[PDB]
Design a protein around this ligand. Structure first.
Ligand SMILES: [K+]
Ligand SMILES: [Mg+2]
Ligand SMILES: [Mg+2]
Ligand SMILES: [Mg+2]
Ligand SMILES: [Mg+2]
Ligand SMILES: [Mg+2]
Ligand SMILES: [Mg+2]
Ligand SMILES: [Mg+2]
Ligand SMILES: [Mg+2]
Ligand SMILES: [Mg+2]
Ligand SMILES: [Mg+2]
Ligand SMILES: [Mg+2]
Ligand SMILES: [Mg+2]
Ligand SMILES: [Mg+2]
Ligand SMILES: [Mg+2]
Ligand SMILES: [Mg+2]
Ligand SMILES: [Mg+2]
Ligand SMILES: [Mg+2]
Ligand SMILES: [Mg+2]
Ligand SMILES: [Mg+2]
Ligand SMILES: [Mg+2]
Ligand SMILES: [Mg+2]
Ligand SMILES: [Mg+2]
Ligand SMILES: [Mg+2]
Ligand SMILES: [Mg+2]
Ligand SMILES: [Mg+2]
Ligand SMILES: [Mg+2]
Ligand SMILES: [Mg+2]
Ligand SMILES: [Mg+2]
Ligand SMILES: [Mg+2]
Ligand SMILES: [Mg+2]
Ligand SMILES: [Mg+2]
Ligand SMILES: [Mg+2]
Ligand SMILES: [Mg+2]
Ligand SMILES: [Mg+2]
Ligand SMILES: [Mg+2]
Ligand SMILES: [Mg+2]
Ligand SMILES: [Mg+2]
Ligand SMILES: [Mg+2]
Ligand SMILES: [Mg+2]
Ligand SMILES: [Mg+2]
Ligand SMILES: [Mg+2]
Ligand SMILES: [Mg+2]
Ligand SMILES: [Mg+2]
Ligand SMILES: [Mg+2]
Ligand SMILES: [Mg+2]
Ligand SMILES: [Mg+2]
Ligand SMILES: [Mg+2]
Ligand SMILES: [Mg+2]
Ligand SMILES: [Mg+2]
Ligand SMILES: [Mg+2]
Ligand SMILES: [Mg+2]
Ligand SMILES: [Mg+2]
Ligand SMILES: [Mg+2]
Ligand SMILES: [Mg+2]
Ligand SMILES: [Mg+2]
Ligand SMILES: [Mg+2]
Ligand SMILES: [Mg+2]
Ligand SMILES: [Mg+2]
Ligand SMILES: [Mg+2]
Ligand SMILES: [Mg+2]
Ligand SMILES: [Mg+2]
Ligand SMILES: [Mg+2]
Ligand SMILES: [Mg+2]
Ligand SMILES: [Mg+2]
Ligand SMILES: [Mg+2]
Ligand SMILES: [Mg+2]
Ligand SMILES: [Mg+2]
Ligand SMILES: [Mg+2]
Ligand SMILES: [Mg+2]
Ligand SMILES: [Mg+2]
Ligand SMILES: [Mg+2]
Ligand SMILES: [Mg+2]
Ligand SMILES: [Mg+2]
Ligand SMILES: [Mg+2]
Ligand SMILES: [Mg+2]
Ligand SMILES: [Mg+2]
Ligand SMILES: [Mg+2]
Ligand SMILES: [Mg+2]
Ligand SMILES: [Mg+2]
Ligand SMILES: [Mg+2]
Ligand SMILES: [Mg+2]
Ligand SMILES: [Mg+2]
Ligand SMILES: [Mg+2]
Ligand SMILES: [Mg+2]
Ligand SMILES: [Mg+2]
Ligand SMILES: [Mg+2]
Ligand SMILES: [Mg+2]
Ligand SMILES: [Mg+2]
Ligand SMILES: [Mg+2]
Ligand SMILES: [Mg+2]
Ligand SMILES: [Mg+2]
Ligand SMILES: [Mg+2]
Ligand SMILES: [Mg+2]
Ligand SMILES: [Mg+2]
Ligand SMILES: [Mg+2]
Ligand SMILES: [Mg+2]
Ligand SMILES: [Mg+2]
Ligand SMILES: [Mg+2]
Ligand SMILES: [Mg+2]
Ligand SMILES: [Mg+2]
Ligand SMILES: [Mg+2]
Ligand SMILES: [Mg+2]
Ligand SMILES: [Mg+2]
Ligand SMILES: [Mg+2]
Ligand SMILES: [Mg+2]
Ligand SMILES: [Mg+2]
Ligand SMILES: [Mg+2]
Ligand SMILES: [Mg+2]
Ligand SMILES: [Mg+2]
Ligand SMILES: [Mg+2]
Ligand SMILES: [Mg+2]
Ligand SMILES: [Mg+2]
Ligand SMILES: [Mg+2]
Ligand SMILES: [Mg+2]
Ligand SMILES: [Mg+2]
Ligand SMILES: [Mg+2]
Ligand SMILES: [Mg+2]
Ligand SMILES: [Mg+2]
Ligand SMILES: [Mg+2]
Ligand SMILES: [Mg+2]
Ligand SMILES: [Mg+2]
Ligand SMILES: [Mg+2]
Ligand SMILES: [Mg+2]
Ligand SMILES: [Mg+2]
Ligand SMILES: [Mg+2]
Ligand SMILES: [Mg+2]
Ligand SMILES: [Mg+2]
Ligand SMILES: [Mg+2]
Ligand SMILES: [Mg+2]
Ligand SMILES: [Mg+2]
Ligand SMILES: [Mg+2]
Ligand SMILES: [Mg+2]
Ligand SMILES: [Mg+2]
Ligand SMILES: [Mg+2]
Ligand SMILES: [Mg+2]
Ligand SMILES: [Mg+2]
Ligand SMILES: [Mg+2]
Ligand SMILES: [Mg+2]
Ligand SMILES: [Mg+2]
Ligand SMILES: [Mg+2]
Ligand SMILES: [Mg+2]
Ligand SMILES: [Mg+2]
Ligand SMILES: [Mg+2]
Ligand SMILES: [Mg+2]
Ligand SMILES: [Mg+2]
Ligand SMILES: [Mg+2]
Ligand SMILES: [Mg+2]
Ligand SMILES: [Mg+2]
Ligand SMILES: [Mg+2]
Ligand SMILES: [Mg+2]
Ligand SMILES: [Mg+2]
Ligand SMILES: [Mg+2]
Ligand SMILES: [Mg+2]
Ligand SMILES: [Mg+2]
Ligand SMILES: [Mg+2]
Ligand SMILES: [Mg+2]
Ligand SMILES: [Mg+2]
Ligand SMILES: [Mg+2]
Ligand SMILES: [Mg+2]
Ligand SMILES: [Mg+2]
Ligand SMILES: [Mg+2]
Ligand SMILES: [Mg+2]
Ligand SMILES: [Mg+2]
Ligand SMILES: [Mg+2]
Ligand SMILES: [Mg+2]
Ligand SMILES: [Mg+2]
Ligand SMILES: [Mg+2]
Ligand SMILES: [Mg+2]
Ligand SMILES: [Mg+2]
Ligand SMILES: [Mg+2]
Ligand SMILES: [Mg+2]
Ligand SMILES: [Mg+2]
Ligand SMILES: [Mg+2]
Ligand SMILES: [Mg+2]
Ligand SMILES: [Mg+2]
Ligand SMILES: [Mg+2]
Ligand SMILES: [Mg+2]
Ligand SMILES: [Mg+2]
Ligand SMILES: [Mg+2]
Ligand SMILES: [Mg+2]
Ligand SMILES: [Mg+2]
Ligand SMILES: [Mg+2]
Ligand SMILES: [Mg+2]
Ligand SMILES: [Mg+2]
Ligand SMILES: [Mg+2]
Ligand SMILES: [Mg+2]
Ligand SMILES: [Mg+2]
Ligand SMILES: [Mg+2]
Ligand SMILES: [Mg+2]
Ligand SMILES: [Mg+2]
Ligand SMILES: [Mg+2]
Ligand SMILES: [Mg+2]
Ligand SMILES: [Mg+2]
Ligand SMILES: [Mg+2]
Ligand SMILES: [Mg+2]
Ligand SMILES: [Mg+2]
Ligand SMILES: [Mg+2]
Ligand SMILES: [Mg+2]
Ligand SMILES: [Mg+2]
Ligand SMILES: [Mg+2]
Ligand SMILES: [Mg+2]
Ligand SMILES: [Mg+2]
Ligand SMILES: [Mg+2]
Ligand SMILES: [Mg+2]
Ligand SMILES: [Mg+2]
Ligand SMILES: [Mg+2]
Ligand SMILES: [Mg+2]
Ligand SMILES: [Mg+2]
Ligand SMILES: [Mg+2]
Ligand SMILES: [Mg+2]
Ligand SMILES: [Mg+2]
Ligand SMILES: [Mg+2]
Ligand SMILES: [Mg+2]
Ligand SMILES: [Mg+2]
Ligand SMILES: [Mg+2]
Ligand SMILES: [Mg+2]
Ligand SMILES: [Mg+2]
Ligand SMILES: [Mg+2]
Ligand SMILES: [Mg+2]
Ligand SMILES: [Mg+2]
Ligand SMILES: [Mg+2]
Ligand SMILES: [Mg+2]
Ligand SMILES: [Mg+2]
Ligand SMILES: [Mg+2]
Ligand SMILES: [Mg+2]
Ligand SMILES: [Mg+2]
Ligand SMILES: [Mg+2]
Ligand SMILES: [Mg+2]
Ligand SMILES: [Mg+2]
Ligand SMILES: [Mg+2]
Ligand SMILES: [Mg+2]
Ligand SMILES: [Mg+2]
Lengths: 48, 275
RNA sequence: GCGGGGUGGAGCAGCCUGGUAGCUCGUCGGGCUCAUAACCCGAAGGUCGUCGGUUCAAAUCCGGCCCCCGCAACCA
RNA sequence: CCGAGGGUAGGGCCCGUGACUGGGGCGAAGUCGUAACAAGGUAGCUGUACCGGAAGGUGCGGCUGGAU
RNA sequence: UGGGAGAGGGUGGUGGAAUUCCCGGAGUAGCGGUGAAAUGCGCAGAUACCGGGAGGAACGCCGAUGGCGAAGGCAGCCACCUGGUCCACCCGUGACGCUGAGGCGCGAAAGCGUGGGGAGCAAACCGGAUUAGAUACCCGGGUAGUCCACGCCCUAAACG
RNA sequence: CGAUGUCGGCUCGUCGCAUCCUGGGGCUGAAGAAGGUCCCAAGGGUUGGGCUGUUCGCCCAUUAAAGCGGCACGCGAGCUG
RNA sequence: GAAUGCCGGCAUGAGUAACGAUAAAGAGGGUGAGAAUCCCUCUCGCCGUAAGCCCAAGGGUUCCUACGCAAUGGUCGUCAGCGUAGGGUUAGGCGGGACCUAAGGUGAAGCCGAAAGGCGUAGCCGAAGGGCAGCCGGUUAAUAUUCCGGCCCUUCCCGCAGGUGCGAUGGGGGGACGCUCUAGGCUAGGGGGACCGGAGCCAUGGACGAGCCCGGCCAGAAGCGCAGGGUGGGAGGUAGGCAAAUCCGCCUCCCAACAAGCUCUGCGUGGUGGGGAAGCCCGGGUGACAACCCCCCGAAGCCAGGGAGCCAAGAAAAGCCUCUAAGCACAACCUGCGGGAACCCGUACCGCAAACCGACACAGGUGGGCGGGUGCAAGAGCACUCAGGCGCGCGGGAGAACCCUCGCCAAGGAACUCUGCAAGUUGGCCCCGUAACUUCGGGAGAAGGGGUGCUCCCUGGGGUGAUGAGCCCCGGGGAGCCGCAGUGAACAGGCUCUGGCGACUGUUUACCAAAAACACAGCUCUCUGCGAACUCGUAAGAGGAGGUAUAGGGAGCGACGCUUGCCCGGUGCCGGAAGGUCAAGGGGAGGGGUGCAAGCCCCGAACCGAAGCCCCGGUGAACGGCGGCCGUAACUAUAACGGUCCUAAGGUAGCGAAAUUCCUUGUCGGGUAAGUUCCGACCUGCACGAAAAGCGUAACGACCGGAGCGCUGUCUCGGCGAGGGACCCGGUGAAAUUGAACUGGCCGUGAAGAUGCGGCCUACCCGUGGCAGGACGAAAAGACCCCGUGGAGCUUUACUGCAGCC
RNA sequence: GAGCUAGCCCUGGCCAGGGUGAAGCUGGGGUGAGACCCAGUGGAGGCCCGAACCGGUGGGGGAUGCAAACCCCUCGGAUGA
């Protein structure tokens, strides 16, 4: 049956991407936390 | 008027459509139309704020001239009468001798090929617009401004009419389509005659499909819901209302008046509506 | 199991607040009518379901026993 | 080939009968009222409508086959 | 051909009296209703009076024992459209007539459908009386309906 | 109650005897035939349908008879539901 | 040493289940240490509206080649989407960007909000929509509309020539639009040819033939032809298109009019450039100077912005054309020609799947185009088959029970069972025929029946062509032949009668309910006069609606038909400038503290004083509610009738043992041999009843009842057969569970159901295939029930508070 | 977090073939004129049958599955809410 993951490069970058995070206070505090934790990638990677 | 159908499907039994015989032109004026953005009942928050709306036929909006006092004295020929999907009334296409082209809602008896005019001197003739004070007391009238130069507010729907009953001072007394008696300012314009397409109320939609064409989505009774959805929701089996009949939001829906008590226009309403 | 009830022949008041039983109808006698009904004037008839207790005194307050309605009997 | 007729299928008319039901006629001395005949005690009758235990009542309009 | 009388019919328009409602004034202890009363209405200012307003229906006097219509039926006034009908003249056609099973149309009231309208009236219904009872007559209310438009119904003491 | 699956049916039985039938008896208000009643006896047998989820029961047509109970109201790691 | 503890390790179950679609395999010859599994060949089978081909998304080197087999591959492996290494993706024209706008998003102006932020016209962003210039063939192990070849084209810059009032973001035109149906003419595609080209072929009885087999094109600029689309011309006035305007709009006049002219596409032709089969021979070569033609079928595609009808009335913006304004007319723009210039990103490969979403090389899921032929009425259905692609990554045997999927069955034919559940039956087309009832459409494919192949003969009409031949499309008649059987295979309704419920098509608990539930047109009540009511929001602002009472919100009812009765005492809502109560505030009779005192300071009565509440009326398609007892008729029985108590009023019509009836399988009738169900009635309705609508209703229903016909392995009552498993052999090898176990029966005992205790009985040790009575077998710290002063959802005239409203 | 699912918005796309034959239109009849009837033409519809496509009615299988919802037979819709 149709499952929950239906990849979409545009949907990916526009929802979790760097610019979407930077726009909002909660999105910025995400990047702050993942930077503070040492995450190698602060945002999901997508090809474009 | 009111075209019937033979019962060759279950829904054709009662479905009636307008006869459209007054229409003389079946495609709008390109210069007078603009896209009518369907809202679906969603406001700028994206939230449904008027329930059960959406999914109707695409429509373009006809720019209607609800002023008419800004072309005072310039006569105009009635070029056509056209179907308008944004209103119950028909609309009339005017070719001003000025060369300008405007739409107005088509009053009853209006004939394509006649002239109309607007102003304090206009003949008391179907389709002409004059300040309310210059219109003879007793004549039916439509598309009435509620305040001078603010645009026609009352008696715009198909078949509707307001009658000038009397006047006192700067104000005349109208009987609105509802039967309310209201003082409206004499400088407010109005178009003599009643709005045409009076057969509009005898249309039998015929089936659920026609309400969907009109953009009206299915309405679900409060009694059909659960208590988390509605005062009337729940009960084992069917249940009477079991409290004063209420809306989804709690307020009583049988009789409870809701016009603001201290509204300033109260001073200008002579008698609340009838029936 | 829980609530109410039983009083002239009929249907009901009085019980709660002890001492006084009352209303409409019916019944009986008289009247009017040619006669009946209606109507009018008078009158009779209830020891208050039964027993036991309380009290100076019980239709009335407290227990039974009889009886008559009503309500309940749910989770499996 | 046609062919009495037999078989299968579906119709149409008539007859008999059927729990129950609907009124109808008739029936020496039943119960309820008194609608009509006198102005019958609200003049009657009427087509219709609605209502009521029952006769009937009432509305609308008509008729005189209504008295004084 | 020339004339006449008429609520003949249809459409649109319009006039005054009255009733109710509404508003302003004025005014006070009752009004109303009946056989008698009660219900009802009224000091929260009714009734009775004046002015203003809104709305529906019906047209007093003329009016008659009258007129027109095939009947049902038709009554303020005006204009339009239209039917019948009588008289005159003795001009034209030359029996072209009478009746009429079927058919078609018209058809009071009530009633029905879809809109509208709704003052007064009033089945149903409520109430007050009367009464043994009173699902009545009488009184206070009151919904259809009565009115308009379109479409049905097609009955009658549709009677001379 | 850190679970012992709950009615009825189907399937498969097995047991008890307070015996429905068949076998053996006494008594009879047992003439015969056919019954009644009690005693012995569990070897075998103890039908097919209509109705209802039904067990039960009622009924139809038969029968030598159409027995009654136990087995976690036998039997859902066998089925049905 | 226990915490269903935690982490790890290793056991048990066990050489057990399984090894992932039943489309299927066999041999030969290669390679290699090793081969069912890799390569080649031949044979066999499967898909063929795909299981073939091409795009898009997603994936991201998986592509090609060499080397390789430890792990990955459900077996094997020499093979691979695996390991290692090298190579591979080439564009002005294809897609996106340097163009346009859509929703939406963002947002100079502006607005709002404690902060964060919310909103917002323009503008900007935003595409699978608009717009825009490349077609065919060749080549690589791997890319190609990209490289090459042939033939075309676009824009930018500059220049020459000719022409013109040039010039924009601004004005205008245009772009520009729906649904259904559809004309003419083409193209794609396909069928046929006794014509044309071809390696060959003659078999096994016949055929050297008008034989079989193979192929018979593709692209192309200008021009031309056919087809269509688009489109009036001129003049006078002009106040409108927010300046101007010769443009556009409006008015008049003249001419043009199903035309024509002009213009733009499609198709054809077209210089020219390519392609070119079977077969044979080792991807190639040959065939080959390959041929390259005629007839027919023919689109849903093209001409296109075509046409008609309909209502539900069908984006925007740029490119483009025209107008003019500043400016400028040494300019600038238009047209033609010439030279030059033309950037960034993608391009491999998978792509209905082993490379994408499902933890797997997972029977599932995934949008667009092409999708050939024959026959079956048509078709994308079905059967077979082309091109192409596969046999599904464990096999070999055996021929048990039992399971799955399938085939047949004597006699019976629902006797099965909760139920004909399931499975039969019926089955397409043509013709005959078709009832109650109905809202006149329907019911209807009602029901029921007949026909169906092949051969010969006669003949009717249509398309094309030409009016004929040929090919093709509908037919009509006559005579025959064969078989058990002619839609001979495959795909393709069982029917009827009668109730309940819901009018109907629709909708729904994704993953146990598809229903009578929801919705629905329709009906009514109610609110709302517009800065509407209402809704979201603290707000601004939105929705409502660029709508206006024939409109919008809320509620109930639920097509339609005939109807919808009585109660306003209580609650709700509505109306009511009186009366009563009523807070803050006003008021200040009058007391108090303190001070020498002026004073400062506190308390405080009458009285005035909103909404609300009380009170007075209204109101039911508002919440709701619609009696009891006793008596009475000339047989009995029963009460039309009466008496009395109560109520705010005492259930009207219609219906009724009902989706409602407890007693109950009520009673009677029908159907049955038999009927707790069913249908029709009755009425003492435990406990129907009128918009939580009442009673009906044609049509409809994968709804739920009852019956009949038909037909059946449902059954009496089972039997046989097929295949996939199960069984055996080689390969690979789980799982839950598991205190340890050396783990028998009876009768007892025991915490009351004992392999484990007693007594007795029985019993050599170990397996394998089977069956499920026990191990109170496994699974899940019982969902039921209770307990916890445990939790949550929900309700209200519980308490208290808050939003909102007054 | 709406890459699942629910609704809405914007922009595109899809729905083989066959059947039924509404209005209108034309002609004919009819009438004072009509209504209306008849034939032809026409091609309407939450019409009919049936693939793609969207569903998920009944039954069987599956149940440490091919699969944490699948497979087979059957069945609903398929110009429309
Ligand atoms: K337990
Ligand atoms: Mg899903
Ligand atoms: Mg997706
Ligand atoms: Mg993407
Ligand atoms: Mg994308
Ligand atoms: Mg996206
Ligand atoms: Mg976002
Ligand atoms: Mg982003
Ligand atoms: Mg920010
Ligand atoms: Mg911040
Ligand atoms: Mg910050
Ligand atoms: Mg790093
Ligand atoms: Mg992130
Ligand atoms: Mg109709
Ligand atoms: Mg009809
Ligand atoms: Mg019209
Ligand atoms: Mg525009
Ligand atoms: Mg809008
Ligand atoms: Mg926004
Ligand atoms: Mg929303
Ligand atoms: Mg709303
Ligand atoms: Mg909505
Ligand atoms: Mg409107
Ligand atoms: Mg209109
Ligand atoms: Mg005003
Ligand atoms: Mg309507
Ligand atoms: Mg619409
Ligand atoms: Mg609803
Ligand atoms: Mg509910
Ligand atoms: Mg519910
Ligand atoms: Mg919620
Ligand atoms: Mg709540
Ligand atoms: Mg609530
Ligand atoms: Mg409720
Ligand atoms: Mg409920
Ligand atoms: Mg419910
Ligand atoms: Mg209930
Ligand atoms: Mg209630
Ligand atoms: Mg409420
Ligand atoms: Mg409110
Ligand atoms: Mg009003
Ligand atoms: Mg009393
Ligand atoms: Mg007392
Ligand atoms: Mg006392
Ligand atoms: Mg006494
Ligand atoms: Mg005493
Ligand atoms: Mg309970
Ligand atoms: Mg014979
Ligand atoms: Mg009398
Ligand atoms: Mg009398
Ligand atoms: Mg009466
Ligand atoms: Mg008074
Ligand atoms: Mg006073
Ligand atoms: Mg009025
Ligand atoms: Mg003469
Ligand atoms: Mg009449
Ligand atoms: Mg009274
Ligand atoms: Mg008369
Ligand atoms: Mg356990
Ligand atoms: Mg357990
Ligand atoms: Mg014996
Ligand atoms: Mg025995
Ligand atoms: Mg039992
Ligand atoms: Mg029983
Ligand atoms: Mg015997
Ligand atoms: Mg037993
Ligand atoms: Mg047990
Ligand atoms: Mg028991
Ligand atoms: Mg027991
Ligand atoms: Mg048991
Ligand atoms: Mg089980
Ligand atoms: Mg069981
Ligand atoms: Mg078990
Ligand atoms: Mg320990
Ligand atoms: Mg633990
Ligand atoms: Mg652990
Ligand atoms: Mg662990
Ligand atoms: Mg571990
Ligand atoms: Mg370790
Ligand atoms: Mg280990
Ligand atoms: Mg092992
Ligand atoms: Mg084992
Ligand atoms: Mg296994
Ligand atoms: Mg498997
Ligand atoms: Mg082999
Ligand atoms: Mg091998
Ligand atoms: Mg090997
Ligand atoms: Mg090979
Ligand atoms: Mg094919
Ligand atoms: Mg991957
Ligand atoms: Mg390996
Ligand atoms: Mg190695
Ligand atoms: Mg491996
Ligand atoms: Mg595997
Ligand atoms: Mg090797
Ligand atoms: Mg490569
Ligand atoms: Mg190039
Ligand atoms: Mg550039
Ligand atoms: Mg964007
Ligand atoms: Mg684009
Ligand atoms: Mg578009
Ligand atoms: Mg391009
Ligand atoms: Mg080209
Ligand atoms: Mg090529
Ligand atoms: Mg190379
Ligand atoms: Mg210029
Ligand atoms: Mg420009
Ligand atoms: Mg356009
Ligand atoms: Mg447009
Ligand atoms: Mg062909
Ligand atoms: Mg060419
Ligand atoms: Mg000008
Ligand atoms: Mg050569
Ligand atoms: Mg198409
Ligand atoms: Mg096109
Ligand atoms: Mg349409
Ligand atoms: Mg725009
Ligand atoms: Mg110069
Ligand atoms: Mg030029
Ligand atoms: Mg650049
Ligand atoms: Mg490439
Ligand atoms: Mg697929
Ligand atoms: Mg693959
Ligand atoms: Mg595989
Ligand atoms: Mg797969
Ligand atoms: Mg072919
Ligand atoms: Mg076929
Ligand atoms: Mg295979
Ligand atoms: Mg496969
Ligand atoms: Mg094998
Ligand atoms: Mg074997
Ligand atoms: Mg199979
Ligand atoms: Mg067979
Ligand atoms: Mg055979
Ligand atoms: Mg058989
Ligand atoms: Mg049979
Ligand atoms: Mg048979
Ligand atoms: Mg049966
Ligand atoms: Mg059986
Ligand atoms: Mg069959
Ligand atoms: Mg078949
Ligand atoms: Mg019949
Ligand atoms: Mg018939
Ligand atoms: Mg029938
Ligand atoms: Mg019927
Ligand atoms: Mg019919
Ligand atoms: Mg059919
Ligand atoms: Mg034949
Ligand atoms: Mg043959
Ligand atoms: Mg033969
Ligand atoms: Mg069928
Ligand atoms: Mg339904
Ligand atoms: Mg339903
Ligand atoms: Mg119903
Ligand atoms: Mg209905
Ligand atoms: Mg449908
Ligand atoms: Mg479900
Ligand atoms: Mg669920
Ligand atoms: Mg679920
Ligand atoms: Mg359900
Ligand atoms: Mg369904
Ligand atoms: Mg639902
Ligand atoms: Mg419905
Ligand atoms: Mg209705
Ligand atoms: Mg809010
Ligand atoms: Mg708006
Ligand atoms: Mg309905
Ligand atoms: Mg009917
Ligand atoms: Mg009634
Ligand atoms: Mg009340
Ligand atoms: Mg009240
Ligand atoms: Mg009241
Ligand atoms: Mg204050
Ligand atoms: Mg107050
Ligand atoms: Mg009450
Ligand atoms: Mg009954
Ligand atoms: Mg019964
Ligand atoms: Mg019933
Ligand atoms: Mg029921
Ligand atoms: Mg009941
Ligand atoms: Mg019963
Ligand atoms: Mg019985
Ligand atoms: Mg019988
Ligand atoms: Mg009875
Ligand atoms: Mg209700
Ligand atoms: Mg109910
Ligand atoms: Mg029905
Ligand atoms: Mg249905
Ligand atoms: Mg259904
Ligand atoms: Mg049956
Ligand atoms: Mg049968
Ligand atoms: Mg069998
Ligand atoms: Mg086998
Ligand atoms: Mg091994
Ligand atoms: Mg292995
Ligand atoms: Mg041990
Ligand atoms: Mg041991
Ligand atoms: Mg052992
Ligand atoms: Mg043992
Ligand atoms: Mg014990
Ligand atoms: Mg034991
Ligand atoms: Mg032992
Ligand atoms: Mg022992
Ligand atoms: Mg011991
Ligand atoms: Mg022992
Ligand atoms: Mg033993
Ligand atoms: Mg073994
Ligand atoms: Mg074994
Ligand atoms: Mg066992
Ligand atoms: Mg077992
Ligand atoms: Mg066990
Ligand atoms: Mg245990
Ligand atoms: Mg056990
Ligand atoms: Mg067990
Ligand atoms: Mg479990
Ligand atoms: Mg726990
Ligand atoms: Mg527990
Ligand atoms: Mg649990
Ligand atoms: Mg308990
Ligand atoms: Mg507590
Ligand atoms: Mg406690
Ligand atoms: Mg608690
Ligand atoms: Mg919870
Ligand atoms: Mg998505
Ligand atoms: Mg379709
Ligand atoms: Mg046909
Ligand atoms: Mg036409
Ligand atoms: Mg299924
Ligand atoms: Mg089945
Ligand atoms: Mg499962
Ligand atoms: Mg499946
Ligand atoms: Mg299937
Ligand atoms: Mg279908």
């Amino acid at each position: 049956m149709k499952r929950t993951w239906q990849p979409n490069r545009r949907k990916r970058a526009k929802t979790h991407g760097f610019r979407a995070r930077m726009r909002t206070p909660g999105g910025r505090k995400v990047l702050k936390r993942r930077r503070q934790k040492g995450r190698w990638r602060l945002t999901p990677a997508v090809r474009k | 008027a009111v075209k019937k159908f033979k019962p060759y499907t279950p829904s054709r039994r009662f479905m009636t459509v307008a006869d459209f015989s007054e229409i003389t032109k079946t495609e709008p004026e390109k210069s007078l139309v603009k896209p009518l953005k369907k809202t679906g009942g969603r406001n700028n928050q994206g939230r449904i704020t008027v329930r059960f709306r959406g999914g109707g036929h695409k429509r373009l909006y006809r720019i209607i001239d609800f002023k008419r006092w800004d072309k005072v004295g310039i006569p105009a020929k009635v070029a056509a009468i056209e179907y308008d999907p944004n209103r119950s009334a028909r609309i009339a296409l005017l070719h001003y001798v000025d060369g300008e082209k405007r739409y107005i809602i088509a009053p009853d008896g209006l004939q394509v090929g006649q002239q109309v005019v607007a102003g304090p001197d206009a003949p008391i003739q179907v389709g002409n617009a004059l300040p309310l004070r210059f219109i003879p007391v007793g004549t039916v009238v439509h598309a009435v401004e509620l305040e001078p130069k603010k645009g026609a507010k009352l008696a715009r729907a198909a078949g509707t009419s307001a009658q000038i009953q009397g006047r006192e001072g700067d104000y005349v007394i109208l009987r609105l389509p509802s039967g309310e008696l209201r003082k409206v300012h004499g400088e407010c314009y109005a178009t003599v005659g009643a709005v045409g397409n009076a057969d509009h109320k005898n249309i039998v939609l015929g089936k659920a499909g026609r309400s969907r064409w009109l953009g009206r989505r299915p309405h679900v009774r409060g009694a059909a819901m659960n208590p988390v959805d509605h005062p009337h929701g729940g009960g084992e089996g069917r249940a009477p209302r079991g409290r004063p009949p209420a809306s989804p939001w709690g307020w009583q829906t049988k009789g409870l008046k809701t016009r603001k008590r201290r509204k300033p226009s109260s001073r200008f309403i002579i008698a609340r509506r009838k029936k």
